[PDB]
């Protein structure tokens, strides 16, 4: 078949869009007349000398902005800002219309956006710089739709989603072929958790432009993850990596996470689990040979090293991530959770409970941190406190599928005795969730259910005891057999009772 | 081990929030959208020559609904004769 790569959509496009759009050499006419100069961006192009030459020759603003874009690709954000400023100082822009000055103001706006993005810090200062540049551009030329796109992006960064959505509605009124408007709308919808609504926009943008940056396939894979079709997500991410093999390590990280999830939830045997887990570790390490300080990779490796009893290195990585990415609360929550898990072996119940609470406060979506908090409450013999916390969490999250939480609730209520009905409900929910997940149902839940049903239904209790015995197999104990025999004796099953007693 | 099983169930669900770095959109990222002032319009009109057919078959497979039938005509107004 036809190879799926960047060259595929290169050949799909006409040769005008193939070579010219990716030229690394810029042709600049000279002020002397027909003389021109060609400077290759592969070589080390100096910003100051190039700007001085451009000002002397008074070249078209397109060349200035193209050089700025290339220096952006080089990462020279300061150099691109210098290019923009000296272009504003150039005679061409001063003698041109206000439209060119507005376009360069919007370019400086994009420069501020990239400076904020590349650092994820000083957000207010760069946002103010970008806002001032965008306001100047709009005042100089308000008819440019790029000013509206910049306004919408500014609203999105300040979480003014309604105004950005209105701006994208206006852009859709102007034209429905605007790819950037589609991307911004889909980003806002994903931020608003409208995964499917953003997914239609992702598909439309991908169909319109398969070579558009940012990659729509990243959002499509996120939606497939939200729609459980993670296999298609991985396939689309592989296609994106083929199209974008550079500066897209996040796709490889997502692929590694998907492989780890598949290994956890699909390995049919221990040997297959080991093979898949080691392959995922090798792929993660190969990605780490490019970047060795990525906080998410360290957090992921912390799980493996905690499972390897390397708690000291887990603490080192957690502290390093906390120092680097304290802005991200999710990393703080994960580090606190791992510190509490490490201290659990040390049984620092007060310290582990405090760490679990801090993890919950950092990121409330971390259910595991709350479950560890409840477990630590149990460790400190806080039966009532753990019960109250668990009831609060369940009543706030009645739709959450925390099977172990429901099992613990059932056990606590069985110990209480008076709340047997909630215990039955929670144990049945745990049984159903385990059956849906194809996970081994704990026979202890069956024993608790039989104990509860002793005073309600001997038939259901006996059936649950039989199910627990079938799960145990050779693990049947003396108490289970004695209770089965007593059940059959009460059922007048003399033969079965005698066999169970034997 | 109960918390380990809970982690395995959860895996890295809530850790994908930071991975949204691909959602950010910047104009300068595209190489050829800026080389001319109207390169945006040219590239928006460069893909009008392309369609779903020109998409790669594997990328077409990525277009999954979240075939024509012979008995559903498209309406007309002048007919023929």
């Amino acid at each position: 078949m036809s190879l799926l790569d960047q060259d595929y959509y290169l050949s799909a496009l006409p040769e005008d869009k193939r070579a010219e759009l990716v030229t690394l050499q810029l042709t600049i006419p000279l002020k002397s007349g027909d003389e021109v100069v060609t400077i290759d961006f592969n070589e080390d192009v100096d910003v100051s000398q190039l700007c001085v030459l451009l000002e002397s020759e008074n070249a078209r603003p397109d060349l200035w902005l193209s050089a700025a874009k290339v220096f952006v690709s080089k990462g020279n954000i300061a150099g691109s800002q210098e290019i923009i400023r000296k272009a504003l100082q150039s005679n061409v822009i001063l003698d041109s219309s206000a439209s060119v000055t507005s376009l360069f103001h919007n370019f400086s706006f994009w420069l501020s956006l990239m400076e904020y993005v590349s650092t994820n810090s000083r957000e207010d200062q760069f946002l103010e710089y970008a806002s001032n540049s965008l306001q100047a551009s709009n005042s100089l030329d308000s008819g440019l739709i790029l000013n509206g796109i910049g306004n919408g992006v500014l609203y999105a960064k300040s979480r003014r989603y309604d105004e950005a959505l209105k701006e994208f509605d206006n852009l859709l009124k102007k034209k429905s072929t605007n790819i950037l408007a589609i991307l911004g709308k889909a980003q806002i919808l994903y931020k608003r958790q409208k995964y499917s609504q953003a997914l239609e926009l992702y598909q439309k943008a991908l169909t319109i432009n398969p070579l558009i940056v940012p990659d729509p396939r990243l959002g499509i894979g996120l939606c497939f993850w939200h729609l459980n079709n993670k296999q298609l997500a991985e396939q689309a991410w592989h296609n994106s990596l083929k199209v974008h093999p550079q500066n897209n390590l996040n796709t490889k990280i997502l692929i590694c996470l998907a492989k780890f999830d598949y290994c956890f939830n699909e390995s049919k045997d221990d040997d297959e689990f080991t093979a898949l887990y080691r392959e995922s570790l090798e792929f993660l390490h190969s990605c780490l040979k490019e970047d060795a300080k990525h906080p998410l990779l360290l957090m992921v490796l912390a799980s493996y090293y905690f499972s390897k009893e390397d708690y000291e290195k887990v603490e080192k990585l957690c502290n390093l991530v906390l120092k680097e990415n304290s802005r991200n609360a999710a990393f703080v929550s994960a580090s606190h959770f791992w510190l509490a898990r490490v201290a659990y072996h040390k049984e620092d119940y007060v310290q582990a409970q405090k760490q679990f609470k801090q993890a919950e406060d950092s990121q409330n979506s971390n259910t595991l941190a709350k479950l560890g908090y409840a477990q630590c409450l149990i460790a400190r013999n806080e039966v009532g406190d753990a019960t109250i916390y668990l009831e609060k969490f369940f009543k706030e999250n009645q739709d959450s599928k925390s099977s172990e939480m429901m099992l613990l609730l059932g056990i606590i209520y069985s110990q209480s005795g008076k709340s047997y009905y909630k215990a039955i409900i929670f144990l049945e929910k745990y049984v159903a969730v385990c059956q849906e997940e194809n996970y081994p149902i704990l026979p202890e839940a069956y024993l608790v259910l039989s104990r509860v049903y002793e005073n309600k239904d001997l038939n259901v209790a006996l059936d649950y005891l039989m199910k627990a015995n079938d799960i145990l197999g050779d693990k049947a104990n003396v108490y289970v057999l004695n209770n089965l025999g007593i059940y059959h004796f009460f059922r007048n099953n003399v033969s079965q009772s005698s066999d169970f007693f034997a | 081990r109960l918390l380990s099983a809970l982690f395995s169930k959860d895996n890295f669900r809530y850790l994908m929030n930071e991975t949204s770095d691909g959602l950010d959109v910047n104009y300068l990222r595209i190489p050829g959208i800026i080389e001319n002032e109207k390169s945006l319009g040219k590239l928006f009109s460069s893909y009008k020559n392309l369609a779903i057919e020109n998409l790669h078959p594997d990328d077409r497979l990525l277009l999954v609904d979240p075939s024509p039938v012979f008995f559903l005509r498209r309406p007309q107004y002048v007919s023929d004769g």
Partner: peptide, 30 residues
């Protein structure tokens, strides 16, 4: 039988021991 075959140590809770049985050397900075 794949429904019963998949039930093994990691599902039973011996996942940590399995990871301990998998040894790998990283180029750790810390």
């Amino acid at each position: 039988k794949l429904e019963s075959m998949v039930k093994s140590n990691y599902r039973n809770g011996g996942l940590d021991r399995i990871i301990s049985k998998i040894d790998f050397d990283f180029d750790l900075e810390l």
